[model samples]
Target: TCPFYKKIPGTGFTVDAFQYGVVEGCTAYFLTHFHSDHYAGLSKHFTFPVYCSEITGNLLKNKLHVQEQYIHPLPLDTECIVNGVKVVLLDANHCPGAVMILFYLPNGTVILHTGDFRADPSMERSLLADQKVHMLYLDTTYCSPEYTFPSQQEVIRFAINTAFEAVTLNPHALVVCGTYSIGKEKVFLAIADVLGSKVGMSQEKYKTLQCLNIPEINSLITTDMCSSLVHLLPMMQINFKGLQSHLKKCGGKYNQILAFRPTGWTHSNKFTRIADVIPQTKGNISIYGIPYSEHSSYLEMKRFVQWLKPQKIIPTVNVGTWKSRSTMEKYFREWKLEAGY
Candidate 1:
């Protein structure tokens, strides 16, 4: 249900990949990032003109084996003409090569599709100044007021410091950092650099990170557990049960096991769910949920909408959770804020 695709009316340009059955006659495809949820339907058998960032192109080619001819690399901040419309890619600040697409249509209409992005002051200055945005496709991942969390920079610092503290408490512990296959590589890289150790990851994850071509990261990846103090676990395994399974099998290999899950859900006050920091201990295992999210929070999304006043806002996914157009209008009105450029 998450591989959503949208077509620009009259322009014939599409955004993101859809299930193989749905995308047949699109003129071109635009991939904002390489998250599996966003790229679930893409396969090697597909042949279509796909536009995305250079990092994303490499990952597709090396990991998914997508044909090079079908993958067109779109440089950031540079304007390119695609199908007669002016298009520019801006840093999404979510992950490596993630971008916000700005399309200047031929009919004087400007459309912005923020695939999935966090707060960035540069984007506001560049895209909001003197630009009349007609349509906005927003990523309402955390659209409620209760979803307030710290910025990514703050979260990153917290994670690095937290991991260090956890390791200091138990020098022989295996400090595991949970991350996605494509995104959240920064957290592990930072932890590895600060702790003076390489990170151990699965061969599949290593190949994905290798495609990023980041020299610092390439030097920090390893498969030999004995060669590294930090182990990079998949994001889904950041939970208590997930960590317990691994620690149980690897008992005595390390004195203790600590995990850090960098996610925004930690802002909520529930031990049952993910948190900003969970210090709970079960046996010799501990887990911390760091709030290092790449998507905009409720306040940030509200601030963004108020800055760039779009005529309409389209919810990208989970329509039931996202506020309706009228509700969003009323909420902004209650804040006594005007939406405009």
Candidate 2:
């Protein structure tokens, strides 16, 4: 839950504000994505109207079973008036149904809510950075200078090559890539494609993939555990004890295990050695935590904010209290000054 930080200033709307205790005087709820942190307090509780992207709406209904009548799915890049306020949805590139929402208030003020996103320069073209936002609510997940890491492309290549070389050396080794409910699909799917192997995933996870309506999922995925060497595992399962338990019950199919947990927190540019990433035991199981992040790195946020140059920037993540938030706003202010906007 948040300390009234998720509330959008001067509006009845709140983006990703479910954890904020359903604040008083908030008439409508605007959801950016389906991540648990954003939609935590959302299951049949308030029954307040929820507005989100189309795919997100499908997930809320099929997965979490959010009340059907109140969920509104807006089309990507299309503008519509909801509760007399103009709204537009833009692809966030963080997850399947993730979106960056825009609110055009009655006073002709534009408010941008960047729902947990991976900031890319290409977004400027697609998202139309020409308009100056009156207020910008950004995804400050990796906002600090210490959070600078490699780009998603570089991390993906590192993950692929690590597994490819590992499998080449030990043919009897099983490769399990770690992922979330909807994110990190590119990493595991690419691994399967390059290795020319079928991906084994649980039926529960496969249902969410089916909701994406993409044929590539059908081509790359399979349900049988015995038929595939590469498995899509939940991130929590990639841990040392977790994988060890899995190896014990593997029915002797694999001689060794090579696992990858792809995330931004694992490796950074400051880390020079590969050993900084992993540890193995008994020469049987090895797990690598690679920097394959879906969120923007520190520099990515700097670039995004500088290019957009909103009149006022608001912190979405890490907004613990007034003092902490003020500390973060100082960084935004510095960046704003450096941008000469």
Candidate 3:
């Protein structure tokens, strides 16, 4: 939900707007992660200096082919000076190499840019806990009473338990989990570990996973699709037709398909309880839509704002229109009141 017309307001620092086009006062560009929506305007031809975490920097160079010189890989949890502006990065707890940025402007202002993150208890001990934030650029994707979600820990356990249950019922069932280019590694990776099943993915995805340097994942890697019944796939391909075809392609070695379709959402009334959110099934294909979002839920957002108590907050997602902004605006006002800061 990044708007084409957004920025950090009085500064030239554009936190996540490579797609907003060229601007007169833009001092530099900063990428929070490798997600497409966050890095939309970037191209191999991109010559502007963009700063990001080391993993994201590697992604920029290897994945996007952006020049090595232009991609500055700032190490995490340390303060560094760029153009005399103090900047520090902390893992966003959202993706493999994603980070939440903290930039202290030359004008005595401090800002925190949360590039799409889920809430975590450790954030209280994070670098931001020490700095007094003047403004909080938030990932307010679900900033309303109409939405909420269970903890990521709870959801991950549910996914793992569900996979275990299905596999136990039919020992030969093929387990598939939907994933994005990045993120959700914990869910499927945990399932694979608990079930003692190897993982399968495209050669390209396998290469990307390797780049992350997760030593444990090495053993789960397999060269043949049929070698491992537990697999990772694109989120869009978790449908009944997609699952059916994949099993067929396995040439009868795999019998049934149990897939978890995890998406960043919840319209609320149906919580993350297994019985609450039912699964869709047809014959041998079973699909579970887990409300496992990468962004913070409405309750999570409230917890963050109340604790951090920033002087100002600019909603990042859902900022495309006037109605969207106002809807989030009132909530911020309430949070500010609750914090009394």
Give per-residue CA lDDT, model 2, range 209-322, as digits (tens).
777755667788988878888987788889778887877767888889888877566434565544345545556888776777789988888998898888888777887668
> Model 3 compared with the native: what TM-score?
0.93
Who is ahead in TM-score, 2 or 3? 3
**For each candidate, what TM-score against the reference?**
0.88, 0.91, 0.93
Q: Candidate 3, residues 306-335: lDDT per residue as tens digits? A: 888888787777887899898888888887
Best by TM-score: 3
In model 2, the Cα lDDT at residue 174 comes to: 89
- What lDDT does candidate 2 reach at residue 88? 85
For residue 173, what is the lDDT in candidate 3? 94
Better of 2 and 3 by lDDT: 3
Candidate number that wins on lDDT, 1 or 2: 2
The global C-alpha lDDT for each of the candidates, from Candidate 1 onward, is 0.77, 0.80, 0.81
RMSD (Cα, Å) for all candidates, in order, is: 3.3, 2.4, 2.2
Ranking by TM-score: 3, 2, 1
For model 1, residues 151-241, the per-residue Cα lDDT tens digits are 6667778777877887787778888887765677778888888888999878887888888868766578987766788888878887778
Number of clashes recorded per candidate? 2, 0, 0
TM-score of candidate 2 on Cα atoms, chains taken together? 0.91
- State in Å the error of residue 317, model 1: 2.8
Lowest summed lDDT over 10 consecutive residues: which window, candidate 3? Answer: 266-275
